[PDB]
Design a protein around this ligand. Structure first.
Ligand SMILES: [Zn+2]
Length: 267
DNA sequence: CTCTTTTTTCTCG
DNA sequence: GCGAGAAACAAAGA
């Protein structure tokens, strides 16, 4: 669940639940509500959903007039809109019941989280998380990006995954971005020349923007994406690179599975 | 049976 | 502060 997948979920939710009054909230796994489930149930029951926003890989439900429910899907979180009589599935943990349907949150690994905070605490919340800029030409400044890369000895893939240089990249799109920009994942950032940094900056924006347009990569809301048919290296071990023909290899970098073309991504 | 594979954040040294 | 390794947790494959 990287930025593209989260944005796809945000869009579907925006089109379907905005304006809906929450009738009741139930939980079989209350511990995933970091701010306290009973407190959330008390505060949100009877309130109306005003909108759905996103920051990085974080979903933000705008409920009532001053409430903000921050939701992170982590690795396996999935939302689905179902009928009120829908049977329970093994990994369903929370449900927001409406008059003519319910929003169910499921997460096999139980990594996902819910946090209820106030409207004026959202900006501070993300500053504390140290989340970087959104991947858009408007917010992602190439100049600062370049300066941070020049001052570090960190490897490019692990650094990009930190969410500090830019928000939204996960294992899938970081591998796709580096292949597009012809940069090896273990390259120390202070070794990147200006032309490469420029290509990388543009590629981060292009790949993520393309993934959003195609509804993310599907493998519930959002399982309609088509980006998985556009992947050039992630999970393509042993296949031929679409540019040079060499076999895509898979190695481990900072503990993460890493796919790359040994020819196009030198070093 | 064991070992490995698949976002965020903390413990070590 | 950093890098290495791993925990949180569940399922499936070698
Ligand atoms: Zn290649």
């Amino acid at each position: 669940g990287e930025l593209p997948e989260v944005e796809t979920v945000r869009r579907e939710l925006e089109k379907r639940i905005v304006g809906q009054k929450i009738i009741s909230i139930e939980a079989t796994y209350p511990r995933m509500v970091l701010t306290g489930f009973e407190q959330l149930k008390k505060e949100l029951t009877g309130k109306t959903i005003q909108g759905i926003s996103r920051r990085g890989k974080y979903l933000i439900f705008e409920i009532g007039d001053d409430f903000r429910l921050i939701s992170h899907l982590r690795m396996e979180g999935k939302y689905r809109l179902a009928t009120l009589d829908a049977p329970r599935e093994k990994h369903d943990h929370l449900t927001m019941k409406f008059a003519d349907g319910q929003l169910i949150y499921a997460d096999v690994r139980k990594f996902g989280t819910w946090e209820l905070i106030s409207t004026d605490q959202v900006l501070p919340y993300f500053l504390k998380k140290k989340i970087g800029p959104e991947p858009t030409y408007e917010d992602f400044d190439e100049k600062l990006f370049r300066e941070k890369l020049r001052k570090s000895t960190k490897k490019i893939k692990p650094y990009l995954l930190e969410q500090t240089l830019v928000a939204g990249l996960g294992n899938i799109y970081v591998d796709e971005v580096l292949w597009l920009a012809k940069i090896h994942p273990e390259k120390e950032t202070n070794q990147l020349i200006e032309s490469s940094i420029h290509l990388l900056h543009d590629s981060i924006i292009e790949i993520l923007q393309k993934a959003i347009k195609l509804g993310g990569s599907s493998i519930a809301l959002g399982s309609t994406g088509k980006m998985q048919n556009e992947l050039q290296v992630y999970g393509k071990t042993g296949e031929k690179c679409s540019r040079c023909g060499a076999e895509i290899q898979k190695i481990k970098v900072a503990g993460r599975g890493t796919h790359f073309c040994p020819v196009c991504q030198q070093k």
